[PDB]
From a paper:
Two structures of PaFPPS with bound GPP were determined in the course of this study: a ternary complex with GPP and Mg2+ and a quaternary complex with GPP, Mg2+ and a small molecule derived from screening of a fragment-based library. The overall structures of the enzyme sub­units in these two complexes are very similar to the structure of the unliganded enzyme (r.m.s.d. values of around 0.3 Å) and no large-scale conformational changes have been observed. Note that the lid region, residues Ala227–Gly254, is also disordered in these two structures. In the PaFPPS complex GPP is well defined in both subunits, whereas in the quaternary complex GPP is only bound to subunit A. However, the binding mode and interactions of GPP with protein residues and Mg2+ ions are identical in the two complexes. We were able to determine crystal structures of these hits with PaFPPS, including a ternary enzyme–GPP–[name] complex. In the ternary PaFPPS–GPP–fragment complex, the fragments only bound to site SPB-1. Finally, we note a systematic difference in the occupancy of ligands in the two subunits of PaFPPS. It appears not to be related to soaking of ligands into the active site, i.e. differences in accessibility of the two active sites in the asymmetric unit, as this finding also holds for the PaFPPS–GPP–fragment complex obtained by co-crystallization. It is possible that these observations reflect cooperative behaviour in the dimeric enzyme with respect to substrate/ligand binding, but this remains to be corroborated by further experimental studies.
Numbering used by the authors:
A (entry chain A): 0 to 164, 167 to 227, 247 to 294
B (entry chain B): 0 to 163, 166 to 228, 247 to 292
Amino acid sequence: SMIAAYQARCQARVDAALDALFVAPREELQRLYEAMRYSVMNGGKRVRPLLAYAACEALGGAPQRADAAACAVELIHAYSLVHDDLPAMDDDDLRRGQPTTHRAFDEATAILAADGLQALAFEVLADTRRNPQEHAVCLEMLTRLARAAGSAGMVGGQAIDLGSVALDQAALEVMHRHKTGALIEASVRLGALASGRAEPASLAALERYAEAIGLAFQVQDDILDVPTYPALLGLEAAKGYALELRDLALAALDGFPPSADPLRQLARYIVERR
Amino acid sequence: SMIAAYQARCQARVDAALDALFVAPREELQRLYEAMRYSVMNGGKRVRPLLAYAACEALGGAPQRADAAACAVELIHAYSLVHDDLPAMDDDDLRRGQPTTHRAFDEATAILAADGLQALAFEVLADTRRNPQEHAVCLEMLTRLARAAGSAGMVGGQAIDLGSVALDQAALEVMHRHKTGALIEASVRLGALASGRAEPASLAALERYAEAIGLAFQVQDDILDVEPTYPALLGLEAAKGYALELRDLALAALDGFPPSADPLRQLARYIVE
Ligand SMILES: CC(C)=CCC/C(C)=C/COP(=O)(O)OP(=O)(O)O
Ligand SMILES: O=C(O)CCn1c(=O)oc2ccccc21
Ligand SMILES: O=C(O)CCn1c(=O)oc2ccccc21
Ligand SMILES: [Mg+2]
Ligand SMILES: [Mg+2]
Ligand SMILES: [Mg+2]
Ligand SMILES: [Mg+2]
Ligand SMILES: [Mg+2]
Ligand SMILES: [Mg+2]
Ligand SMILES: [Mg+2]
């Protein structure tokens, strides 16, 4: 599988596009823009960009069409991690072994940098030079991202995670579907929209794909860490379920052409990682 | 008093629209949505909605056309105040004698509720049923609000404030223009775009208006506090004179506008009394 090569290509592409967004328009704003840059340019794997590019290719679009989509979903993702790391939330000093933004700078600056990243995400999609889709398509991208990022999506999931106490599998899945599923789903949907060849049946299929891989990731993460999927189902039964989720993802792409292979490969990668 | 009646009408209208946005879609989200509601439905005067409605009317649009614009700018405003109140920012326990959101609920909840409000402001403008403008207009409204709300606007102003040091007037005005001026200017621009009649000249004139009133609000707030601030820099009498000069610049920007701009004229006068 060339998923590692595909991941590296999407990472490089989106990293170049993102890095160009962090130039302060005036000197008084330099430190804020530095905190924004620090919060995004942290060597992340850019899975949500990968998804946008791969969904766009799956429907036959040239990947560059999805550049704004890739940037927007990464910006949302980045802003959410900054807030998640804050003392009032997870109170993390480190993220992937490097100081969190509130430690590198200060708490007010982290809060603010991340708020500015959220606005930027929406700016990038509404900018018809950076996101040169048909207007109705740009508006649909923005609608979907705002719904996915907001209180009925990602932020909702963070609230559900914080508010939770024994969860059963159904409740764990509701939490995951909001906290990470919504934005994963939006990454796929936005890339699909960026293709210019979206239609309802393909969008629905791609939504099924995205649902399945979003959960697969969480199941396999729990397995690798060994109220978790192994605790709930048993270890070996959790491993089984990860395969079933991969299979649902692959089945959702039945009938898609070979250009959907990156999506297929990602589905396998998620459950094969050791 | 004409302005008082106009403000009351805008307040009631936008409050009805806003209140309807805070219904949790499922039970696990109820407390979050309560915190969102608590943060917005707080008896605010709704100056930014007023500006959107009045700019729309100034260009001959029916005010209802600006309903989404009015919501969006108020949602931005509301979110900004929730984050500003947090312990790491202004650490404010009360706003008009009522607990701030982090006090009423908890800090994480407040952070999250406000993050959701920001997303919602964009959702409301991108929704073509709620914001039924021509699609190019919807996108321009969203572009302008995201620029005004973000790190080059409102958030930038908050960063300049934390980064500030005896400021001189010029530096104080750079701070104010970002921290509050961007969003005031966006409110006027979005209401003007909602009219369906915007043109480059009228937009530019309305921007000059908005610049002037945005600063006049700050100068007059400082004066009222007395009755690094405008009175401290200039002395009380000269700060008062400056507020009057800004009102004059605002009225001058409205040269040529029809009587439907009277609300804007009246607001400019109200601010400096
Ligand atoms: C609305 C906000 C701030 C959302 C955060 C969403 C999210 C994915 C947080 C990380 O989860 P985690 O805390 O379980 O994972 P990590 O180990 O990455 O902190
Ligand atoms: O370690 C690496 O740099 C690549 C590991 N990796 C990979 O090979 O494919 C991926 C897809 C998403 C995220 C990570 C992936
Ligand atoms: O007494 C009140 O509650 C409203 C006073 N008020 C008014 O009369 O016009 C206004 C415009 C903007 C904000 C407040 C205004
Ligand atoms: Mg967390
Ligand atoms: Mg965490
Ligand atoms: Mg887990
Ligand atoms: Mg403050
Ligand atoms: Mg305060
Ligand atoms: Mg107070
Ligand atoms: Mg002041």
